[PDB]
Amino acid sequence: STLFEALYDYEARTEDDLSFHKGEKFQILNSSEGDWWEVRSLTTGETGYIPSPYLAPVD
């Protein structure tokens, strides 16, 4: 579909969650699971889950 960017800093709450800073972009792995999306960090190359409302679509 489209890439998404961070609006606010976020710290991983679980062992499977990813930490990021505002302005970080991500590639969507799966977004049909609700307000909780599966993504890949384009900056670190790691995989995990993060809250979808902390992001906004690019362009």
CB neighbours of 34 closer than 8 A, spacing ≥ 6?
52
The answer as to CATH 1.20.140.10 being correct for domain 1-59 is no
| Cα distance between residue 17 and residue 8, in whole Å | 16
| Cα distance between residue 29 and residue 34, in whole Å | 13
Domain boundaries, the chain: 1-59
**DSSP secondary structure of 12-42:** --STTB--B-TT-EEEEEE--SSSEEEEEET
- What technique solved it? NMR
**What residues does 30 pair with on adjacent strands?**
38
